[PDB]
Amino acid sequence: KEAVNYFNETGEATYAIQTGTTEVEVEKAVVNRPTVEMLDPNNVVIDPSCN
Amino acid sequence: VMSQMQNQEAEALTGVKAFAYGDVAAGIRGALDAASKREMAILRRLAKGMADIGTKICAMNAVFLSETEVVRITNEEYVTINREDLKGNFDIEVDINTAEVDNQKSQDLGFMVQTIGNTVDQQVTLKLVARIAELKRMPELAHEL
Amino acid sequence: VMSQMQNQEAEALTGVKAFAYGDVAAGIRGALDAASKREMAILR
Amino acid sequence: RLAKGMADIGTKICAMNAVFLSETEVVRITNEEYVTINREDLKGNFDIEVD
Amino acid sequence: PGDFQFRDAMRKRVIAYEYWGFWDTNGDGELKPIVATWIGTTLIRMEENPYPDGKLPFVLVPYMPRKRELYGEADAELLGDNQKILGATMRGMIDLLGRSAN
Amino acid sequence: GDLDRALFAVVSFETCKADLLKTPDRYHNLDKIDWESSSPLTDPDHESKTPGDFQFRDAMRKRVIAYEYWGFWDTNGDGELKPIVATWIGTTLIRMEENPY
Amino acid sequence: DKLTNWKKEPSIQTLKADLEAGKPAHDAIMKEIQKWNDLMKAEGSAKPPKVKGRSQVQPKLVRRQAEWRYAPLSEPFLSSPKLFKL
Amino acid sequence: WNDLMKAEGSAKPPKVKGRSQVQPKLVRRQAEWRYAPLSEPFLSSPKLFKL
Structure with missing residues (x-):
């Protein structure tokens, strides 16, 4: 997988050997969904100038 | 009898007597009688609302979902959409889909x-x-x- | 007669007169008359 | 009559599009070659019909 | 319900407003979309519109449109006084039946 | 009849300073107009849906009532009517050009 | 107080004032909406007066007309496995 | 015309105690039975203007 990623990044066919392991952060977004919610007309105050 | 006479006279003066969304076929689109075109007049506003919701979500999807999530949902190659032109919906059209639309x-x-x-x-x-x-x-x- | 007159006037003002789930064919999906689309609204 | 109103709106917009949108915007909307329309004859709608 | 509130700390229900609108930020006169959220009297958020479309994130559709008006007119506007007459006649019929001797 | 043969047409609209500043080098004399008064519009001829007691408190969102004279007027004095446009807020003229369309 | 680095940042007082100025029109709109909703379910302004002996039954014609239109206007969105077609 | 449409102003029935003040909106009925048939042609095709 890392070999394929390197080939896509640079372009040199290269195989890999595991030396060790690092410890990275990674800001995963657990929830990434849109929200469509029906709102109450008592809650929205739209500008009355919009002719 | 006077109410009936006035209604008939008004209906004669103005020829308006009282008394299927999408790329639908001809028969269904021509079957619409009176008040069916009036129900469609509200169904189209409701559909425009859903289309606006759909395009708002589609615009948000281009900047919030990473590559991996989309390549996992669709199992196909990720197509990049330029962020500068995301405020125009240039090459994407969105509309609700019904059974009749699918059949046609x-x-x-x-x-x-x-x-x-x-x-x-x-x-x-x-x-x-x-x-x-x-x-x-x-x-x-x-x-x- | 007054109830009938008011009902007819309201039905003329608003053209709403009183009176098959899945990837179903065209005939069954088009056979739905009034109140069948209301029963489907609960079946869904 | 309502359709004639919309046709007039459409031709008014189409005439305005020929002088206000640059080449890039149109080649991005249509993804085809830009066709130049002479500005002198824009007051006649000679070779375009709208409905 | 007015008498419902979570007893714990990070589930307490609060009423937060949100000002979705346009305000000139650089002072040059070009209105740029902004957002703002405040709970009570303390401001807790102020950014530019994060959504790509650069518009208010609301979609409004009328039922029966009002000519050159943002809001729409519902169904019970024309149906006014028809319910009144029909109810006043049904109540009269029920009065006639029930206030009798059977 | 025939709107094509109408020599003028005056239109009113509720513009704001931000709208005028959207396209610069088109509107002149933009400093004579009062822009920070928080005064609701009181034009007796323009009928709109804005409530009479609504007016933005800030500076570049204030609602003003600007007219627009779309018509024909001979400019060179030779008698050939040439299309013109004109916009004035209150008593100050802020725009005068030929018909851009 | 100054959350952002803008050259001109709105203050909560200004936003609250704008909301207060825009409120009355929305109040009238919600007055109309409340009247329609009261007519819908025969309560409040349309509540028949209850006096002893006489009836207080009010047929819900508005609700009947609304229920004979809720379903035909919602089925188009629920008929296809895919809602939006692009 | 607008006052006749919504039964207010000049067409507002006079309210006197005892007698009714109900005015059927025949003009509004005729107008609503014509709003929809005249608007659908513009909303039936994915492309509004054909040139």
Whole structure:
């Protein structure tokens, strides 16, 4: 997988050997969904100038 | 009797007597009688609302979902959409889909296959039949075809 | 007669007169008359 | 009559599009070659019909 | 319900407003979309419109449109006084039946 | 009849300073107009849906009532009517050009 | 107080004042909405007066007309496996 | 015309105690039975203007 990623990044066919392991952060977004919610007309105050 | 007379006189003065969304076929679109065109007049506003919601979500999807999430949902290659032109919806059209729309689209694809079936090569016809199979909810036949 | 007159006037003002799930064919899906689309609204 | 109103709106917009949108915007919307329309004859709608 | 509130700390219900609108930020006169959220009297958020479309994130559709008006007119506007007459006649019929001797 | 043969047409609209500043080098004399008064519009001829007691408190969102004279007027004095446009807020003229369309 | 680095940042007082100025029109709109909703379910302004002996039954014609239109206007969105077609 | 449409102003029935003040909106009925048939042609095709 890392070999394929390197080939896509640079372009040199290269195989890999595991030396060790690092410890990275990674800001995963657990929830990434849109929200469509029906709102109450008592809650929205739209500008009355919009002719 | 006076109410009836006044109603008839008004209806004679103004010839207005009291008394299927999408790329639908001709029969369903022509079957609309009175008050059906009035129900469609509200269904179209409701559909415009849903279309606006859909395009708002589609615009948000281009900047919030990473590559991996989309390549996992669709299992196909990720297509990048330039962020600068995201405020125009240039090359994407969105509208709600109903059963009648699906049926008419399948019939249109069948008609296209019938028309260009011997002139063009096999790839175009096979792709059209694969789209027909996708409309029929057979995602495996689409890949096999 | 007054109830009938008011009902007719309201029905003329608002053109709403009183009176098959899945990837179903065209005939069954088009056979749905009034209140069948209301029963489907609960079946869904 | 309502359709004639919309046709007039459409031709008014189409005439305005020929002088206000640059080449890039149109080649991005249509993804085809830009066709130049002479500005002198824009007051006649000679070779375009709208409905 | 007015008498419902979570007893714990990070589930307490609060009423937060949100000002989705346009305000010139650089002072040059070009209105740029902004957002703002405040709970009670303390401001807790102020950014530019994060959504790509650069518009208010609301979609409003009328039922029966009002000519050159943002809001729409519902169904019970024309149906006014028809319910009144029909109810006043049904109540009269029920009065006639029930206030009798059977 | 025949709107094509109408020599003028005056239109009113509720514009704001931000709208005028959207396209610069088109509107002149933009400093004579009062822009920070928080005064609701009181034009007796323009009928709109804005409530009479609504007015933005800030500076570049204030609602003003600007007219627009779309018509024909001979400019060179030779007698050939040439299309013109004109916009004035209150008593100050802020725009005068030929018909851009 | 100054959350952002803008050259001109709105203050909560200004936003609250704008909301207060825009409120009355929305109040009238919600007055109309409340009247329609009261007519819908025969309560409040349309509540028949209850006096002893006589009836207080009010047929819900508005609700009947609304229920004979809720379903035909919602089915188009619920008929296809895929809602939005692009 | 607008006052006749919504039964207010000049067409507002006079309210006197005892007698009714109900005015059927015949003009509004005729107008609503014509708003929809005249608007659908513009909303039936994915492309509004054809040139």
